[PDB]
Design a binder for this molecule. Structure first.
Ligand code: SFG
Length: 325
């Protein structure tokens, strides 16, 4: 019969629209989504196929669900939950009494002959408590948040102001749904934030930049991370690429620094819109970052998602996921 398994995704509060979309794009590329449901920081997925979890940037934790029950029904599910000869512990998230209930459910498991220690568990039982509903399962993935810190743009040999941060850079590459061995293009690559995240996930990156010094510097950064890719001198308005040659596009557009510069970027948006549609494979995606509303320039695409990230009172990033019809 049914081959899907229930998985819980505990999402980063940073941006729930990016967080939900990321999971859904990758699940649809790696496997088959039977159903999905979202409630605040929780995303429940009935899914089959290849696990894509280690690529996630806006998901904090992924748990394989055994059962969903009430806060009063936790002792019944823990009496039937499968036991393994490997070291385990219980970890509760949300509500109050976390520490006491972990010790309580851990004791119940210890009575059934389970090896339980908090320090170095091999297996972690997770309890997500929300609206008097308990999501019980086994931890599959926990995002190492330090990874993104250690790759911050200021830690790379080549530095430029306002470079996209690795967590957002990885999530945007992920939103294109590009796979290992496929090509991700950043046509205004700069320091290479997007190319680095793509490269590290085994995607073949290609960057284009119209400043030679920046092309050189981006190449240095890719070399620094041991990434094999191509950084070319060129203009995003006139891509040195064939029609339908790339699976995905992830880019940060230039930002208008002043309202006195309104309209200066019109040809850039119109021409890159045309160029992106041309080079993207059929059903291909472009994850783009702007500081202005540009929906109208991309009317030739499907606008799958549009979100905002208010950084400060002067800058609101518009994040779009565009798909070729
Ligand atoms: N038309 C273009 N073709 C290729 N590279 C470009 C073009 N316009 C800008 N760039 C490059 O894009 C990079 C910066 C952009 N990714 C935008 C970053 C940031 N949002 C900013 O406004 O500065 C720089 O390295 C530029 O050289």
């Amino acid at each position: 019969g049914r081959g899907s398994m229930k998985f819980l995704f505990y999402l980063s509060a940073d941006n729930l629209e990016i967080a939900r979309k990321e999971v859904l794009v990758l699940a649809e590329r790696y496997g088959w989504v039977e159903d999905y449901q979202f409630e605040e920081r929780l995303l429940l997925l009935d899914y089959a196929g290849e696990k894509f979890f280690e690529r996630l940037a806006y998901t904090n934790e992924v748990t394989k669900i055994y059962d969903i029950c009430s806060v009063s029904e936790l002792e019944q599910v823990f009496s039937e939950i499968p036991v393994y000869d490997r070291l385990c512990c219980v970890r509760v998230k949300g509500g109050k009494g976390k520490t006491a209930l972990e010790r309580k459910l851990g004791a119940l498991l210890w009575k059934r002959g389970a090896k339980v220690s908090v320090s170095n568990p091999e297996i972690v039982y997770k309890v997500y408590i929300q609206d008097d509903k308990c999501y019980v399962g086994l931890l599959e993935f926990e995002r190492d948040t330090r990874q993104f810190f250690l790759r911050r743009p200021d830690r790379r040999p080549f530095l430029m102001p306002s470079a996209i941060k690795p967590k957002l850079a990885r999530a945007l590459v992920n939103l294109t749904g590009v796979l290992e061995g496929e090509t991700l293009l950043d046509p205004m690559c700069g320091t290479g934030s997007f190319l680095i995240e793509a490269g590290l996930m085994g995607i073949n990156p290609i960057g284009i930049d119209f400043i030679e010094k920046i092309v050189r510097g981006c190449r240095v950064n890719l070399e620094y991370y041991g990434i094999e890719g191509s950084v070319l001198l060129g203009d995003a308005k006139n891509l040195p690429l064939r029609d339908e040659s790339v699976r995905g596009i992830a880019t940060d557009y230039p930002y208008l620094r002043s309202t006195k510069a309104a309209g200066t970027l019109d040809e850039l948006y119109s021409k890159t819109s045309e160029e992106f549609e041309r080079v993207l494979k059929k059903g291909g995606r472009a994850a783009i970052v702007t500081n202005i509303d540009v929906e109208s320039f991309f009317s030739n695409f499907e606008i799958e998602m549009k979100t905002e990230e208010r950084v400060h009172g002067s800058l609101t990033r518009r994040i779009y996921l565009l798909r070729r019809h």
